[PDB]
């Protein structure tokens, strides 16, 4: 909500409380789990005009649990999604750092529209997929405002040495060129960077450079969206096996993601989607799937400011899985406030 | 304060800052303790008005403690005490869910009015008493519109497995019963719910079920303020053994709770208070009292927004109590702002 | 930004994005470290007019670290800066407690204008040079409204007995005399303090009282920033011997701080700064230098809202260093969006 709009300087500070809960036999072998998924979210967008052809903006957003207790736990699940601060002069673009997106779901997001689940490639703290802290991005919309819906965006990770390989990364650069016409829209990103140290010395995952690169395609408008999304990485995506307390990375994934969603005029929006992500050579297994399941739901929207939902996923993985992948399916129950 | 009002959604972002000192002798082994205790908090009460009939809402709630250090201790204490989400239609009544008071705080509030402590029942994480996460909650006003002041209210409790039995609860339901006029207000409160796996295995509290039950009486209208609470509890308030480090749940308690206020036009809300609380069947013990003290106080209000308040704790429990509960008188100093 | 301002009260709800990289050969060995330090902030100052002489006033400052991943380690670095509520009567001056700046901050603040660095005597949890959790604080201005310009404060902390040394402290009491006439300003603050039980087990660091003094000199007008302080310690400095991971305390340092700054009317404040800081009698070294460095940066103001700054330090520690403080120079380039 906009909160203040005074000389040349726009706040909006914004958050959401969403009850949510998921339905599992079991939680502890399913897609999702079983229980209290409560959480709330808050955070300030801040715009300033410096002046008629340069423009500032700043950026954070917090996340706190509302399934913790008021003791020792009470953390677990809070932290701090995005905070960058930003330049953009005329169509000559746009300069920000900070924790922000990497560069790679400029494609993603093509399919993160669901209710609750899908989007499972974006990673956070995973290089270039999902949100990640200490990248300079600039951006480029129109090209220098002369080719009308021709976007490109360029991004330099600086290395994040962590006490724990999954959310440690070495320095890199990543891209993404898009184009949209007439309701449609083309995307396509890439990102390379170092393994640190303790990334080298974990079991899953050989080699010395990560690697993610994925395309996008997709219709949105009139009321219809649909999307698809084809990656692979090389040393990037982070994996589990549950059958040895093991960790570290697949050295390849091929990773597909389809959506498609409608909106109707008195509030209801609709979502089939389709998510499978298989890795190849992992070590002392071979080929396993990570993410594989169909998914059915719906989203209410009483207005822009409350909303309930229903988000089922039939999940497709099997039983035997190597990996130990909960193989069970998960349904979740949402009521949202946001301003 | 109301900080924004547009479009049939209003928010409120409200918080506020607490300098609070605790004076005991030893605090070690007092009621409240000694030292700085002072405290800020911040939240959001969102409401939008999505029809004639029909209206959405949503609140969050954090405590920031203000006497920990910027080292390693700075969350200690730290946590979201509110975050729900919320429908209510016409005269139909009100659900929503999340992070809330248990039902029984529909009783036990009616003694909840003392400047810092008392209130001492309404333990939070502890089924049905304060606050939870993950409460299903019904409400009704009015009786669906059709009988004044009569408001009942159902809710339902899903398990919390947590990492500690004192946070931890099961499947339960529980509801209240209550009726105001010219004036008074007299109120039912009842809930049971199951235990878990970790807090049977616990060396005081026997059974698979726990129950909270408590009544409420009240004046409260022309300046006076005067309270009565009467609870008993199966196997439900946590209990500690400081002489062997010992912790669990007590096998029953009888709660009286009795208060009485006044507020003088000119700012001045003394306050007076009588809380008892024994627990009864503790193993190895028998019969100890945990809560026993009467309550000297006064908070004078400046205006709406800012405050200071002294509030004496008379301690009753005596130098042999057989769980180690702290004996000793403890005294607190406020200087409160809020929005 | 001033986002509520009705029926005698106003909040002031403010924060900041930072971007945020530090460049060093290394980190691990130099002054400031390397990596990302992007960080956010939030706070809220709010101000209610009680009546015609009497004000009410409250203060609480967050800080959230955008450097950390949003795996595990979330909360490092996270912290509550101030959290204080008080009162203002007329010329009578102001009392005010909680979380707050120690009196000696009252002079050490003339050098603390650099960019980034700079103000590195004034430790947090450290007595009465920074920020402190529980402190009494009385503050007058122009001696009672008789004496333009002198302002003198006395300020009572409270004991806190944490689990580390380096965070805690027993009762105290400081002052600050103050006198600014015509551009100038001069500055003098006293304070001693008990040493905790755990401070005096230490190895470094021999006594029971802890004492913190400052003077403060500086011209203040005409776009110029000039500023000089000399401050000595008993007890009161922390130290680290990174070569034997000792800790505790320095039984005196001297400490020089000296700022010259110039502020352009189309938005440049460039800085040259000197800062020094010997540590006397350190048990089984002697003499150690702590902080001894030559300070190059500048800040851009496209707005009161926007900025960018670079910030370097040349770092006249030697390779040598007993305590093994980096002697290697750190340059800090940020991005800063504020409201």
């Not at 953390?75 to 002069?89: E, I, M, S």
């Not at 408008?221 to 999307?227: H, P, R």
């Not at 697949?250 to 969603?261: E, G, I, R, S």
């Not at 929006?269 to 297994?285: H, L, N």
């Amino acid at each position: 909500a906009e909160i203040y709009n005074k000389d040349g300087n726009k706040v909006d500070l914004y958050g959401k409380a969403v009850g949510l809960h998921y339905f599992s036999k079991g939680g502890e072998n399913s897609y999702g789990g079983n229980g209290d998924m409560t959480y709330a979210r808050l955070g300030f967008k801040g715009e300033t005009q410096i002046n008629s052809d340069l423009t500032g903006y700043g950026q954070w957003e917090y996340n706190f649990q509302g399934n913790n207790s008021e003791g020792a736990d009470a953390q677990t699940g809070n932290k701090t999604r995005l905070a960058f601060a930003g330049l953009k002069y005329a169509d000559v673009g746009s300069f920000d750092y900070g924790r922000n997106y990497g560069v790679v779901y400029d494609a993603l997001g093509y399919t993160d529209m669901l209710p609750e689940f899908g989007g499972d490639t974006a990673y956070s703290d995973d290089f270039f997929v999902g949100r990640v802290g200490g990248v300079a991005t600039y951006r480029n919309s129109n090209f220098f405002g002369l080719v009308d819906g021709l976007n490109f965006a360029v991004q330099y990770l600086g290395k994040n040495e962590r006490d724990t390989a999954r959310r440690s990364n070495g320095d890199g650069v990543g891209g993404s060129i898009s184009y949209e016409y007439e309701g449609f829209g083309i995307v396509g990103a890439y990102g390379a960077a170092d393994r640190t140290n303790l990334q080298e010395a974990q079991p899953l995952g050989n080699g010395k450079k990560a690697e993610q690169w994925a395309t996008g395609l997709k219709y949105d408008a009139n009321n219809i969206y649909l999307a698809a999304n084809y990656g692979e990485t090389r040393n990037a995506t982070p994996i589990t096996n549950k059958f040895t307390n093991t960790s570290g990375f697949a050295n390849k994934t091929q990773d597909v993601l389809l959506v498609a969603q409608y909106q109707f005029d008195f509030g209801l929006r609709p979502s089939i989607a389709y998510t499978k992500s298989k890795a190849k050579d992992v070590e002392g297994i071979g080929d396993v799937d990570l993410v594989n399941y169909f998914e059915v739901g719906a989203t209410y929207y009483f207005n822009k400011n409350m909303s309930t939902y229903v988000d089922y996923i039939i999940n497709q993985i099997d039983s035997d899985n190597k990996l130990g992948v909960g193989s069970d399916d998960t349904v979740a129950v949402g009521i949202v406030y946001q301003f």
